[PDB]
């Protein structure tokens, strides 16, 4: 005899679930016995045992016996009817990143402040079996379990959900975690990631990142380092063989400062391309410590002379960044040195040509978040003459 | 030539430090050059370069040259004059516990919210060299470094202090961490740890823990599992060969609930004994969920009958603890099962004798902290008769 449930063995709280049992095509009456608590249970070689509303009293192990003319038959295969949604959901994150190479392992972390017994990792699919881990107490408070995932083969999507339960009720689980998707990244030609805005972004500006491909990718995914999830847009192909997508991030805040990569995939493939070259988004006006800029000889100089730009601060910044107005390339970063009661970096422009003329600004930053910058220094005009 | 500092190379902020240089017993004048910043410095084959108050301008590398009749001599051994106390101190803890076996390794953890570059571990001693590690960003925020310590030989004390600094100022360190001591535990005969109070302690009661030894230990250390530090008392010997110490913990709070062990050491030895048998301190009245106690047949029973005490709760406790009034042994713990809309544990007293009569109480607890209990149930009187 067999025992199963039509919607599934994992049922959310307060939703219908039907249990079906199968005999040997000939039986007078079936009986259902929950393991331990319920003695009796009752409700065409099949029997229907409906539960209009799933509650914690129905969660447990179920067995089925069909009574034939010769007597009671063998016990059926036990069925775990799991209820979910009884506790606040856990958190689920990828340890290095949700981006993993095609093949190769990675770690997922279940996490909650109350899940001190067991965690369950479920993978989206058809006949996927859950994995259980013992919970671990963290030094800073809370509980976590680290699930090894891999090798991540690019034959299908990889989506996961976290659960926790307690020892006394093994079939009563918490609310599901937010799903997390894992992207396998291959060796296909990388896209190109370009920014439409300047090197350093003022708060409130509009930012649009643009991916493009000369091999004709249909989907594009933009991922920022250190985040849980990614963005996803379809690719536009006005001309065949050259696709592109735009990621409008709206008014920029401090959370928009970071390192960005984007990936492309074809129409019927779950494998993604190699990452683009990283793009760094810098946000000015995040630190109120001041910086100043000054030319060591002077603003007005002659060609061929030794000119040094000095960005200095009374605060102990970690690095300084020099930007030229009109320049599209990323700013030049230099570590700070401790001088005569100041912290400074020297930006050598020796020998000076006529192409070095323009407006310069400098910024300070700390290594804790090297994408959040200070307010710009007062602009400096470098004048050159033959 | 040599270069050193009398108080030491690690000097707290705003304290005197003196730098001495030694030549070839014959030199007209010594000179001191700080690496990079200061060119000149000046202030019987020795020269005294005093610093009335140590500041961050004096922190760096120093070299000494003595000028003889034949010219300048070789550069001296560079001296790293380190200033401490410039930042808030980090935290320092032992990963499993400060108790380690004699020999064998352990891990110390430096920790701060700002130490994102480097951490320094200093061991107390005469000529101990500091160890530096790169900082690691934590998922929950903050920074840490994990230092391998071992093998911990019981020839001396093991005390450590944590520091952090930044890349731009390598010789400017934070305030020292609180010192942490490591105790090597050997295979000497374990002490005995007894409690003067009952099994379960009500909040506000006085608790005194008592260690004792029949081998004549002079020092006693009491350690509670999961803590950073330990307690330490000298042992009293009214009679030779039998020492003891009392650990008065005052009015008990929730922080007094835990697992306790204590160790003993002799007068001129840094090796400690084997741990005592663990002692668990339970604190009642910490959980406001209710438990109740009832005899399944009834309070009044006859000897030889089957009697079961049932502690149950509407709340989903993890375990139940049965306490008999007057009993000195620890309470009996049983996991809870899910019943007819209740959670309960059955405490079998079948067959019942005349020694089972008395007053019984039951408590609930959760596995997150199994030493914090609920309020006691209403007392039950078990009456037996022949």
């Amino acid at each position: 005899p067999t025992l199963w449930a039509e919607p599934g063995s994992v049922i959310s709280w307060g939703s219908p679930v039907t249990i079906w049992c199968q005999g040997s095509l000939e039986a007078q009456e079936y009986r259902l016995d929950k393991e331990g608590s319920p003695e009796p249970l009752d409700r065409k070689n099949k029997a229907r045992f409906s539960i209009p509303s799933m509650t914690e009293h129905h969660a447990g192990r179920y067995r089925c016996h069909y009574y034939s003319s010769a007597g009671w038959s063998e016990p059926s295969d036990p069925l775990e009817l799991v209820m979910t949604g009884f506790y606040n959901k856990p958190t689920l994150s990828a340890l290095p990143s949700p981006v993993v190479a095609s093949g190769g392992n990675m770690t997922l972390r279940c996490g909650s402040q109350k899940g001190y017994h067991h965690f369950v990792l479920m993978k989206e699919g058809e006949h996927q079996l859950p994995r259980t881990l013992d919970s671990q107490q963290l030094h800073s408070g809370g509980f976590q379990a680290l699930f090894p995932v891999g090798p991540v083969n690019p034959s299908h999507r990889w989506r996961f959900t976290c659960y926790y339960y307690y020892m006394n009720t093994p079939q009563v689980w918490s609310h599901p975690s937010d799903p997390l998707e894992i992207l396998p990244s291959g060796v296909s030609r990388k896209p190109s990631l370009l920014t439409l805005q300047g090197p350093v972004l003022a708060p409130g500006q509009s930012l649009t990142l643009q991916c493009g491909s000369d091999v004709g990718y249909d989907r594009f995914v933009l991922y920022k380092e250190g985040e849980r999830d990614f963005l996803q847009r379809p690719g536009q192909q006005p001309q065949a063989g050259l696709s592109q997508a735009n990621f409008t991030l709206g008014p920029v805040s401090r959370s928009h400062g970071g390192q960005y990569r984007c990936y492309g995939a074809h129409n019927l493939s779950s494998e993604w391309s190699a990452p683009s070259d990283p793009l760094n988004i810098l946000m000015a006006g995040q630190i109120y410590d001041t910086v100043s800029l000054s030319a060591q000889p002077g603003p007005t100089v002659a060609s061929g002379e030794n000119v040094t730009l000095l960005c200095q601060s009374w605060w102990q910044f970690d690095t300084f960044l020099l930007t030229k107005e009109g320049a599209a390339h990323p700013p030049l970063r230099l570590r700070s040195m401790y001088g005569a009661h100041k912290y400074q970096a020297e930006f050598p422009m020796s020998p000076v040509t006529s192409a070095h003329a323009g407006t310069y600004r400098c910024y300070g930053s700390y290594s804790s978040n090297p994408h959040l910058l200070s307010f710009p220094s007062e602009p400096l005009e470098l004048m050159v003459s033959g | 030539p040599t270069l050193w500092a009398e108080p030491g190379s690690v000097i707290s902020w705003g304290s005197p430090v003196t730098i001495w240089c030694q030549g070839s017993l014959e030199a007209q004048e010594y000179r001191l050059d700080k690496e990079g910043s200061p060119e000149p410095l000046d202030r019987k084959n020795k020269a005294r370069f005093s610093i009335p108050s140590m500041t961050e301008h004096h922190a760096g590398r120093y070299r000494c040259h003595y000028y003889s009749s034949a010219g300048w001599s070789e550069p001296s051994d560079p001296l790293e004059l380190v200033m401490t106390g410039f930042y808030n101190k980090p935290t320092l803890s032992a990963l499993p516990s400060p108790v380690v076996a004699s020999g064998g390794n352990m891990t110390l953890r430096c920790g701060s919210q700002k130490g994102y570059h480097h951490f320094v571990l200093m061991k107390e001693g005469e000529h101990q060299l500091p160890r530096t590690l790169d900082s690691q960003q934590l998922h929950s925020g903050g920074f840490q470094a994990l230092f391998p310590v071992g093998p911990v030989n019981p020839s001396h004390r093991w005390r450590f202090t944590c520091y952090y600094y930044y890349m731009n100022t390598p010789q400017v360190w934070s305030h020292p961490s609180d010192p942490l001591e490591i105790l090597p535990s050997g295979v000497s005969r374990k002490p005995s740890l007894l409690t003067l109070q009952g099994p379960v302690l009500a909040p506000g009661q006085s608790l005194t823990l008592q260690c004792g030894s029949d081998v004549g230990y002079d020092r006693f250390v009491l350690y509670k599992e999961g803590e950073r530090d330990f307690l330490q008392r000298p042992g009293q010997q009214p009679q030779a060969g039998l020492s003891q110490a009392n650990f008065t913990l005052g009015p008990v709070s929730r922080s007094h609930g835990g697992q306790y062990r204590c160790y003993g050491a002799h007068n001129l030895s840094s090796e400690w004994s084997a741990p005592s048998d663990p002692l668990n301190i339970l604190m009642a009245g910490q959980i406001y969920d209710t438990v109740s106690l009832s005899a399944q047949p009834g309070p009044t029973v006859a000897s030889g009958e089957n009697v079961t005490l049932l502690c149950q709760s509407w709340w989903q406790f993890d375990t139940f603890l049965l306490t008999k009034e007057g009993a000195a042994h620890p309470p009996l713990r049983l996991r809870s099962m899910y019943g007819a809309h209740k959670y309960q544990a059955e405490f079998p007293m079948s067959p019942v004798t005349s020694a089972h009569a008395g007053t019984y109480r039951c408590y609930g607890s959760y596995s997150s902290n199994p030493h914090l209990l609920s309020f006691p149930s209403e007392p039950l009187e078990l009456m037996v008769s022949g």
Epitope: R254, Q286, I287, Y288, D289, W315, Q316, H341, Y366, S368, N369, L372 | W13, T55, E56, F86, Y87, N88, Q113, K114, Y116, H175
Partner: nanobody, 115 residues
């Protein structure tokens, strides 16, 4: 967090003293000082002092304002002298040099209306 004092207003050539007391965390090791807004303008830097008793002064108030610190009570003082009319602003007590987000701790503000 931060509590300010010594507000008000005076005529040209007058003198006012600002005070700022700190509570809630460790503020011994970071610089403390004043920034000021203005009608239609942004927050500039005015003055600061750190643990090593080193002072920082904006060029517009150099040699006119004096900052002092009490390391025992985490309290800083500003001694404004020769108050010019362009000092009319809302001065903010600031804890800078945090090196991490939010990089600053601001005071609720005080009004100076030198006219």
């Amino acid at each position: 967090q931060l509590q300010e004092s010594g507000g008000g207003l005076v005529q040209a050539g007058g003198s006012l003293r600002l005070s700022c007391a700190a509570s809630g965390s460790i503020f011994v090791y970071v610089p403390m000082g004043w920034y000021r807004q203005a009608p239609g303008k942004e927050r500039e830097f005015v003055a600061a002092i750190s643990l090593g008793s080193n002072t920082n002064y904006a060029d517009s108030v150099k040699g006119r304002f004096t900052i002092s610190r009490d390391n025992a009570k985490n309290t800083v003082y500003l001694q404004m002298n020769s108050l010019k009319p362009e000092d009319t602003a809302v001065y903010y007590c600031a804890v800078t040099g945090l090196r991490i987000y939010p990089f600053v701790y601001w005071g609720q503000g005080t009004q100076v209306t030198v006219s």
